Amino acid sequence: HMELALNVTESFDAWENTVTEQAIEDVWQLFETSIKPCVKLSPLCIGAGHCNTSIIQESCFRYCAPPGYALLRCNDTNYSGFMPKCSKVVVSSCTRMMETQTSTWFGFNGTRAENRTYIYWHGRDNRTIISLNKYYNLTMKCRGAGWCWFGGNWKDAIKEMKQTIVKHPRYTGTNNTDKINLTAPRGGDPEVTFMWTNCRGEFLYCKMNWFLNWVEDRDVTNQRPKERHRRNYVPCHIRQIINTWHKVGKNVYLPPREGDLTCNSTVTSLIANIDWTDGNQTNITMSAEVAELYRLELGDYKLV
Ligand SMILES: *[C@@H]1O[C@H](CO)[C@@H](O[C@@H]2O[C@H](CO)[C@@H](O[C@@H]3O[C@H](CO[C@H]4O[C@H](CO)[C@@H](O)[C@H](O)[C@@H]4O)[C@@H](O)[C@H](O[C@H]4O[C@H](CO)[C@@H](O)[C@H](O)[C@@H]4O[C@H]4O[C@H](CO)[C@@H](O)[C@H](O)[C@@H]4O[C@H]4O[C@H](CO)[C@@H](O)[C@H](O)[C@@H]4O)[C@@H]3O)[C@H](O)[C@H]2NC(C)=O)[C@H](O)[C@H]1NC(C)=O
Ligand SMILES: *[C@@H]1O[C@H](CO[C@H]2O[C@@H](C)[C@@H](O)[C@@H](O)[C@@H]2O)[C@@H](O[C@@H]2O[C@H](CO)[C@@H](O[C@@H]3O[C@H](CO[C@H]4O[C@H](CO)[C@@H](O)[C@H](O)[C@@H]4O)[C@@H](O)[C@H](O[C@H]4O[C@H](CO)[C@@H](O)[C@H](O)[C@@H]4O)[C@@H]3O)[C@H](O)[C@H]2NC(C)=O)[C@H](O)[C@H]1NC(C)=O
Ligand SMILES: *[C@@H]1O[C@H](CO[C@H]2O[C@@H](C)[C@@H](O)[C@@H](O)[C@@H]2O)[C@@H](O[C@@H]2O[C@H](CO)[C@@H](O[C@@H]3O[C@H](CO[C@H]4O[C@H](CO)[C@@H](O)[C@H](O)[C@@H]4O)[C@@H](O)[C@H](O[C@H]4O[C@H](CO)[C@@H](O)[C@H](O)[C@@H]4O)[C@@H]3O)[C@H](O)[C@H]2NC(C)=O)[C@H](O)[C@H]1NC(C)=O
Ligand SMILES: *[C@@H]1O[C@H](CO)[C@@H](O[C@@H]2O[C@H](CO)[C@@H](O[C@@H]3O[C@H](CO[C@H]4O[C@H](CO)[C@@H](O)[C@H](O)[C@@H]4O)[C@@H](O)[C@H](O[C@H]4O[C@H](CO)[C@@H](O)[C@H](O)[C@@H]4O)[C@@H]3O)[C@H](O)[C@H]2NC(C)=O)[C@H](O)[C@H]1NC(C)=O
Ligand SMILES: *[C@H]1O[C@H](CO)[C@@H](O[C@@H]2O[C@H](CO)[C@@H](O[C@@H]3O[C@H](CO[C@H]4O[C@H](CO)[C@@H](O)[C@H](O)[C@@H]4O)[C@@H](O)[C@H](O)[C@@H]3O)[C@H](O)[C@H]2NC(C)=O)[C@H](O)[C@H]1NC(C)=O
Ligand SMILES: *[C@@H]1O[C@H](CO[C@H]2O[C@@H](C)[C@@H](O)[C@@H](O)[C@@H]2O)[C@@H](O[C@@H]2O[C@H](CO)[C@@H](O[C@@H]3O[C@H](CO)[C@@H](O)[C@H](O)[C@@H]3O)[C@H](O)[C@H]2NC(C)=O)[C@H](O)[C@H]1NC(C)=O
Ligand SMILES: *[C@H]1O[C@H](CO[C@H]2O[C@@H](C)[C@@H](O)[C@@H](O)[C@@H]2O)[C@@H](O[C@@H]2O[C@H](CO)[C@@H](O[C@@H]3O[C@H](CO)[C@@H](O)[C@H](O)[C@@H]3O)[C@H](O)[C@H]2NC(C)=O)[C@H](O)[C@H]1NC(C)=O
Ligand SMILES: *[C@H]1O[C@H](CO[C@H]2O[C@@H](C)[C@@H](O)[C@@H](O)[C@@H]2O)[C@@H](O[C@@H]2O[C@H](CO)[C@@H](O[C@@H]3O[C@H](CO)[C@@H](O)[C@H](O)[C@@H]3O)[C@H](O)[C@H]2NC(C)=O)[C@H](O)[C@H]1NC(C)=O
Ligand SMILES: *[C@H]1O[C@H](CO[C@H]2O[C@@H](C)[C@@H](O)[C@@H](O)[C@@H]2O)[C@@H](O[C@@H]2O[C@H](CO)[C@@H](O)[C@H](O)[C@H]2NC(C)=O)[C@H](O)[C@H]1NC(C)=O
Ligand SMILES: *[C@H]1O[C@H](CO[C@H]2O[C@@H](C)[C@@H](O)[C@@H](O)[C@@H]2O)[C@@H](O[C@@H]2O[C@H](CO)[C@@H](O)[C@H](O)[C@H]2NC(C)=O)[C@H](O)[C@H]1NC(C)=O
Ligand SMILES: *[C@H]1O[C@H](CO)[C@@H](O[C@@H]2O[C@H](CO)[C@@H](O)[C@H](O)[C@H]2NC(C)=O)[C@H](O)[C@H]1NC(C)=O
Ligand SMILES: *[C@@H]1O[C@H](CO)[C@@H](O)[C@H](O)[C@H]1NC(C)=O
Ligand SMILES: *[C@@H]1O[C@H](CO)[C@@H](O)[C@H](O)[C@H]1NC(C)=O
Predict the structure, then answer these.
(1) Looking at the DSSP assignment, which residues form a beta bridge with residue 236?
(2) Cα 281 to averaged position of ligand 8 atoms, centre (Å)
(3) Are 19 and 10 in contact (CB under 8 A)?
(4) Is 279 left (phi over 0), alpha (psi -120 to 50) or beta?
(5) For residue 79, which ligand has an atom nearest its CA?
(6) Alpha-carbon torsion angle 201, 203, 209, 214, nearest 10
(7) Which residues, renumbered to this chain, are glycosylated (predicted)?
(8) How many structural domains compose the chain?
């Protein structure tokens, strides 16, 4: 039945991307797949040296969630990432997710969101992903019109996060000075900070810049530096037809609704893909989609 492995390939290309790209594309294949004619054809590659073309039988009411897909994890400690000696393994399947909530920025419910911030991270010397987790307060409710609300110490929190990310990258070599900024492009230049949010089915897009207007430095001053007064909401505009971030492309999905849905969600799990490759850059990024959801609970998604 299930006969996985534990191998991975990491390289240079993101358009010719593999695990990621494959995981993403296939997902909307499984997902777009819930509409009924009589008999459907599903694939089923995840790394076997050949492929499975899954075939659902039926006719020509309550159903779980993935007409054809399932997940499972290893086991042992709270979390790390990769280079395991992996052993015991568990059982799981359903995928109702579309129903519930989500975001490109901060994973929702966090659980024993201990005061002391976290940077829980799957490492790769240079090209890697993070998961920051602090107790402090953050809220994020959406109001359907296309504008999202908050509550918390978000300036300060980032500080912690920025206070956080300083302790583990220790003295590299030379006597140095820090200078954090963000982007997240690839091969081309945009110049905007988008985030998405799922909560109750509608797949809503947000133009998020005021939230993301901060240049970081080691030791600073703002006495003689400048001051203007700014406040915040979210100029979201649903894009059922999804305008794709990491690539100026397109996708869609077929949702439900409760007329006046006015989103809501608890913040905890702020994410990032920090870039620090040899030279002059500490490059925070915000791509970390649906497999992070389950990755959020287990340690690391395994699908098939
Ligand atoms: C879905 O779930 C979510 C949960 O996430 C629900 O949303 C949450 O629910 C709470 C209550 O419904 C809500 O509380 C409210 O929060 C507001 C947050 O706004 C603040 O943050 C943002 C970002 O920084 C800013 O835009 C804004 O300026 C605010 O700072 C607050 O506006 C409200 O609380 C405060 O105001 C009222 C009225 O004045 C006070 O009663 C209350 O005490 C708060 O203010 C005092 O305390 C703060 C901090 O201690 C001080 O800064 C402030 O000056 C006040 O200090 C005075 O007053 C108190 C006495 O009251 C006294 O201690 C002190 O001596 C001073 O005199 C507001 O009540 C959560 O924040 C909210 N989350 C979100 C999204 O913000 C949501 O409803 C759910 N959906 C459904 C189903 O409804
Ligand atoms: C695989 O492993 C993960 C961690 O590695 C495991 O390593 C080996 C040695 C195993 O044999 C495990 O001991 C260890 O789990 C698992 O994470 C763990 O998952 C368990 C659930 O099976 C968690 O326990 C739960 O957490 C609550 C926290 O309390 C814990 O601490 C106190 C005091 O130390 C203890 O009393 C508890 O037993 C916990 O250890 C706890 O409140 C929960 O109890 C409730 O739930 C049961 C079940 O329904 C219910 O009957 C009872 O009445 C309670 O209401 C519960 O015990 C544990 O926290 C967690 N620990 C770690 C280190 O992550 C992982 O789940 C497991 N599964 C997978 C994914 O493979
Ligand atoms: C993630 O989980 C979140 C909470 O998780 C908890 O789940 C339970 C089962 C436990 O396991 C906990 O360990 C765990 O933390 C969920 O977030 C919640 O979202 C819901 C709606 O989606 C919100 O519901 C409403 O909450 C009100 C809270 O405000 C109160 O607090 C203030 C602060 O002082 C008080 O002033 C207020 O008076 C409030 O008391 C609450 O009052 C509401 O309850 C009333 O109304 C409802 C409906 O009419 C009714 O059911 C209830 O009996 C009362 O009449 C209301 O329920 C909620 O704000 C929010 N929880 C938190 C953290 O506050 C979330 O669903 C889940 N999401 C994901 C990612 O899965
Ligand atoms: C990646 O790229 C960045 C940007 O190019 C490099 O940063 C530069 O670092 C050099 C180091 O020599 C800087 O040169 C120094 O500038 C000082 C003043 O500017 C700084 O300090 C003030 C106040 O603190 C700030 O207002 C300002 O913004 C700057 O932060 C000078 O005072 C220095 O002269 C003194 O030091 C020299 C030794 O360097 C002594 O011998 C002298 O006695 C003298 O007292 C010096 O000139 C330069 O300013 C930076 N660039 C920019 C754009 O400002 C990184 O080095 C680079 N990193 C890597 C890994 O390559
Ligand atoms: C994350 O953020 C990083 C920093 O913001 C991004 O790196 C930057 O990527 C842009 C896009 O390609 C590059 O911009 C180019 O700059 C070159 C270099 O010209 C400079 O050097 C010469 C020689 O000293 C000097 O004469 C000039 O005046 C310039 O100072 C230009 O030739 C190009 O036209 C183009 O503008 C940067 O090179 C690069 N910045 C850094 C830090 O080096 C990164 O793209 C982001 N990506 C991720 C991973 O999220
Ligand atoms: C940020 O969250 C905390 C947590 O409080 C909430 O916790 C959940 C589980 C729920 O029970 C909800 O009802 C709670 O509000 C809130 O911060 C704390 O707020 C309390 C009072 O609401 C404070 O207690 C007071 O402390 C002061 C100073 O020590 C005393 O003067 C008072 O007598 C009283 O003891 C406490 O200090 C706050 N500390 C924490 C844990 O952050 C807060 O409401 C919330 N902020 C918002 C609105 O975003
Ligand atoms: C991942 O985190 C867990 C969570 O523990 C944190 O919990 C809070 C409350 C705080 O105390 C913080 O210090 C904890 O790290 C870690 O789980 C705990 O780990 C300790 C030691 O790492 C365990 O004690 C051990 O007990 C065994 C017997 O089982 C001894 O043989 C060992 O020598 C040691 O003394 C403790 O049981 C764990 N408790 C909890 C709450 O899970 C975990 O270690 C950490 N993993 C890593 C390394 O990232
Ligand atoms: C991290 O960001 C800082 C500051 O960012 C500012 O500039 C851009 C990137 C934008 O985000 C804006 O909103 C920010 O306030 C970078 O430091 C400064 O970068 C600017 C932009 O190139 C430089 O300005 C220069 O100004 C002269 C004026 O004569 C022009 O002629 C030049 O063309 C040029 O634009 C300036 O060199 C930088 N200031 C410092 C600190 O010396 C920083 O480069 C960036 N670092 C990383 C990690 O990428
Ligand atoms: C949560 O705990 C921190 C303690 O954090 C300390 O231990 C590690 C997390 C490490 O990062 C270390 O650098 C850090 O100091 C509390 O911060 C504390 O604030 C108190 C104020 O009473 C000070 O006495 C301490 O300097 C400081 N740390 C210590 C050692 O306690 C934080 O406020 C606390 N909050 C909650 C809700 O638990
Ligand atoms: C990010 O990683 C690079 C290189 O890491 C090497 O790891 C090997 C397993 C293999 O994948 C090889 O292709 C890859 O280049 C780091 O470069 C190293 O820098 C240190 C410090 O000077 C030196 O010990 C090495 O000479 C040098 N590379 C080698 C192995 O020759 C790079 O510094 C690191 N960057 C950061 C800041 O994380
Ligand atoms: C690199 O610059 C650092 C800046 O700190 C210098 O570090 C000093 O090293 C000297 C010895 O040369 C020590 O006595 C001091 O304690 C350090 N400075 C202080 C007070 O922080 C160092 O000089 C530079 N490295 C060299 C020699 O190239
Ligand atoms: C990758 O996994 C294969 C099984 O497909 C295994 O034989 C091999 O050791 C692994 N190669 C490495 C080390 O990446
Ligand atoms: C592929 O999955 C189907 C379920 O549709 C299962 O019956 C079949 O055994 C699998 N193919 C093989 C031989 O791995």
Answers:
(1) 206
(2) 13
(3) no
(4) left
(5) 7
(6) 60
(7) 7, 52
(8) 1
Q: Are 186 and 286 in contact (CB under 8 A)?
A: no
Residue-range definition of the domain harbouring residue 117: 1-304
277 exposure class (CB count in 10 Å sphere: 0-12, 13-18, 19+):
exposed
Amino acid letter for position 81:
G
Please work out whether the CB of residue 209 comes within 6 Å of at least one atom of ligand 8: no
- Residue 119 and residue 130 in contact, taking contact as beta carbons nearer than 8 Å: yes
Q: Which two tokens stand for residue 47?
A: 């790394």
Instruction: Tell how far the Cα of 181 is from the centroid of ligand 12, in angstroms.
Output: 38
CB of 10 sitting under 6 A from ligand 2:
no
56 C-beta closer than 6 A to ligand 13: no
CATH of the domain at 31: 2.170.40.20
Distance from CA of residue 230 to its chain's centroid? 28
What's the sign of the alpha-carbon dihedral 90, 94, 97, 99?
negative
d(CA 58, CA 36): 9
The answer to whether 107 and 266 are in contact (CB under 8 A) is: no
Which amino acids bring their CB within 6 angstroms of ligand 1? 139, 141, 149-151, 264, 266
Whether 101 and 141 have beta carbons less than 8 Å apart is answered as no
